[PDB]
């Protein structure tokens, strides 16, 4: 792929997402979704191999089905109201269709399998862009249409996402599948808080995006896609492993790190609405995510795995490409708990 073509495809993905986030018309929002998917497929297929082709095929099928359901919901809403503006939807059936379509686009359970499948299939840069941006857009649509969300359906899908992400991440050994299940669990948390505070949804989105960017860029720096490949990083550049360890501790929600702020604020907000069982279950279930984060931390930094002999040549050579904003993402993902009241600025 030509660099000009790649940058124009990235620009087109961002253009689709921005069209979704600036449009006041359902047709224009659907157009933005379609443009985003159309420019996103080749990004997945950039490094051509059967795994990448299969991941792109599964992603295309899922997103096409979601777009069909979304346009059906738009049409049904138009039939009963004659309105194209994105507001509270006027038909419960259309609202259910839209909720299911946006949940499928996000990867909320039980629409999650494509997330680990595609994330394993595609490279690290593709997975980073996929997770971050393709969560960025449908959450914007949901925040706009939150006041008509069915709380029962939204919270059911959110709790399912949390449980399934925890269990899948428990089982996986592949780093990309681990990141995908982490994404599923975090999306569950965000959509669980969504029907109450879109501000808390946005706060969790920002913190999750920062932590995910830091983790993916650390993986790209170490060029490790498996647990054992990451187990050799301590013998080449031990600083990256320590930074990954503190980022993993933050992503598990351990105080006083940045990952505790979204969980804390969401639990507080849901408690304000007389919800106790759901916050307690969500808090207890995240211990699975913390467990497999800790298991990954044991293999990479807290213990020394055996290495090989060509690692001496690797010692002799130095990393060339410089990650952009990696130190900033590492600092923002661990040390911004004292800056919590800025969510009012986020309001």
């Amino acid at each position: 792929m030509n660099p000009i073509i790649y940058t124009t495809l990235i620009m087109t993905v961002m253009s689709g997402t921005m069209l979704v986030m600036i449009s006041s018309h359902w047709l224009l929002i659907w157009i933005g979704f379609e443009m985003n998917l159309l420019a996103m497929i080749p990004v997945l297929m950039k490094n051509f191999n059967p795994r990448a082709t299969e991941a792109a095929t599964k992603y295309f099928l899922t997103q096409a089905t979601a777009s069909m359901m979304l346009m059906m919901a738009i049409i049904i809403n138009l039939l009963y109201s004659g309105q194209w503006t994105i507001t509270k939807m006027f038909n419960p059936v259309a609202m259910t269709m839209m909720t299911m379509a946006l949940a499928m686009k996000l990867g909320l359970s039980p629409f999650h399998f494509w997330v680990p499948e595609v994330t394993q299939g595609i490279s690290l840069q593709a997975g980073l862009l996929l997770l971050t941006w393709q969560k960025l857009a449908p959450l914007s649509v949901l925040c706009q249409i939150s006041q008509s969300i069915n709380p029962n359906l939204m919270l059911t899908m959110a709790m399912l996402s949390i449980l399934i992400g925890g269990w899948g991440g428990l089982n996986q050994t592949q780093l990309r599948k681990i990141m995908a299940y982490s994404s599923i669990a975090h999306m569950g948390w965000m959509t669980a808080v969504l029907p109450y505070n879109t501000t808390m949804t946005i706060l969790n989105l920002l913190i999750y995006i920062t932590m995910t960017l830091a983790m993916f860029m650390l993986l790209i720096h170490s060029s490790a896609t498996t647990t054992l490949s990451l187990s050799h990083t301590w013998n080449k550049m031990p600083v990256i492993t320590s930074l990954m360890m503190v980022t993993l501790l933050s992503m598990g929600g351990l105080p006083p790190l940045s990952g505790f702020m979204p969980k804390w604020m969401i639990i507080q907000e849901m408690t304000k609405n007389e919800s106790i069982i759901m916050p307690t279950l969500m808090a207890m279930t995240a211990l699975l995510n913390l467990y497999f984060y800790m298991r990954l931390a044991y293999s990479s930094s807290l213990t020394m795995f055996p290495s090989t002999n060509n690692m001496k040549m690797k010692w002799q050579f130095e990393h060339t490409k410089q990650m952009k904003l990696l130190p900033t993402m590492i600092v923002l993902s661990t040390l911004v708990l004292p800056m919590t009241p800025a969510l009012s600025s986020l309001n």
Binding site: P151, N273, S275, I277, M278
Partner: protein
Amino acid sequence: AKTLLHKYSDIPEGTECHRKAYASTSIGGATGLIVSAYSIALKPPASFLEGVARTGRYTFTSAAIGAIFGLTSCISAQVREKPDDPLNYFIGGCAGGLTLGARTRSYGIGAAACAYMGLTAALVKMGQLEGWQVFAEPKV
């Protein structure tokens, strides 16, 4: 599902134990049917007869658990003359757990299910008494 739950709740707590058992059996059968549908979808059977056998096994297990829970809880509350008491729901939940253990042929599964289901059913009764809500309506 809402209609079945409404029927079960509308039947009074300590009376009409046969109707309570029937309603709980219907709820359990619906849950088992949903579980069997998801199981067939995700892990396809080797044959139509094997799929029907799996569906029947799961549905009967769930329905038996529900019937035992309803019978035990209603009869316990009736004989003890203490409605609105979580102990009856705990006894029903442990009875359902023992039924699940018998169905799966495992003493350990039966004991763990008795403990967990009894605690869960006691918590459900306490929530009904105290006004706890799982999917709380937005406010504030």
